[PDB]
Amino acid sequence: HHWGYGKHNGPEHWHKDFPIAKGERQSPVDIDTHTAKYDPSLKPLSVSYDQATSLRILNNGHTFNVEFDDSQDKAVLKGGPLDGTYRLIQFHFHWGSLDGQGSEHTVDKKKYAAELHLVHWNTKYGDFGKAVQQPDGLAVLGIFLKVGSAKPGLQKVVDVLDSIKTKGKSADFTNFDPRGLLPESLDYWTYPGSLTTPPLLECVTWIVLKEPISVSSEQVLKFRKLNFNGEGEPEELMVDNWRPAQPLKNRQIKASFK
Numbered sequence: 001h002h003w004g005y006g007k008h009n010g011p012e013h014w015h016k017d018f019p020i021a022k023g024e025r026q027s028p029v030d031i032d033t034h035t036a037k038y039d040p041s042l043k044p045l046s047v048s049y050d051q052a053t054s055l056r057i058l059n060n061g062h063t064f065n066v067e068f069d070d071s072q073d074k075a076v077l078k079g080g081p082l083d084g085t086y087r088l089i090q091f092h093f094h095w096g097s098l099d100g101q102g103s104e105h106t107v108d109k110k111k112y113a114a115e116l117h118l119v120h121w122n123t124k125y126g127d128f129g130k131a132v133q134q135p136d137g138l139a140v141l142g143i144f145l146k147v148g149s150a151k152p153g154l155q156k157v158v159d160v161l162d163s164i165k166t167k168g169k170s171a172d173f174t175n176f177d178p179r180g181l182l183p184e185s186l187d188y189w190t191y192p193g194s195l196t197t198p199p200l201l202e203c204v205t206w207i208v209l210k211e212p213i214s215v216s217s218e219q220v221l222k223f224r225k226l227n228f229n230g231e232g233e234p235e236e237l238m239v240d241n242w243r244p245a246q247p248l249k250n251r252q253i254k255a256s257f258k
């Protein structure tokens with residue numbers, strides 16, 4: 001029926017229902033580190049997550065989202081290549097069936113085990129819905145995950161996945177601190193792009209962190225136990241929910257470091 005990541009409804013078919021899939025600023029893209037332009041005018045990133053208020057976690061059929069209360073400036077992002085304040089609304093992951101694939105963005109063609117997306121919207125627009133109608137309405141912070149040592153801050157998420165195994169399930173998920181998922185450095189690459197899932201809107205200013213965070217094999221294995229299907233339907237493991245790199249076209253990737 002509708003979109004997914006299968007052979008019959010995967011990324012290569014999306015253009016039929018969403019023509020913008022073939023647009024001019026689609027994501028993700030491969031980050032060529034030797035062609036990326038170091039820009040000295042880029043400001044440091046400012047991440048203020050101390051007053052964050054997580055609310056719920058849900059399995060939407062294509063991934064699982066952890067939602068936040070965005071009714072006030074509680075968890076915001078500013079600085080870097082951004083003008084204005086951006087509010088955190090939710091975060092989700094993309095992962096593979098094996099450790100050698102899973103990330104959407106790649107660095108010099110290298111694929112990571114998973115990629116975390118922290119989604120924020122420009123407050124000047126009032127709400128998320130109005131933000132997705134503007135070229136600068138969203139800011140997404142992307143973080144690569146590699147397999148190695150366990151990430152303590154990620155365990156609370158891993159432990160709740162059992163309760164939201166199938167499509168449609170949700171669970172209260174309060175008091176989660178996002179700061180536990182940030183790498184040590186905030187050096188980044190930035191370029192103008194889009195959401196990586198339908199409707200594939202081109203409203204995103206991407207901020208991809210250079211430093212990946214490490215998670216254990218046992219932790220990523222938990223992600224692989226989720227289901228695409230709803231309860232009672234035949235089981236389809238939620239794996240490889242990532243979109244392949246898209247043509248950079250008329251865009252330049254800028255680096256905050258050299």
Ligand SMILES: [Hg+2]
Pocket residue numbers: 131132133134135136137201202203204
């Ligand atoms: Hg837009």
Ligand SMILES: [Zn+2]
Pocket residue numbers: 092093094117196
């Ligand atoms: Zn995403």
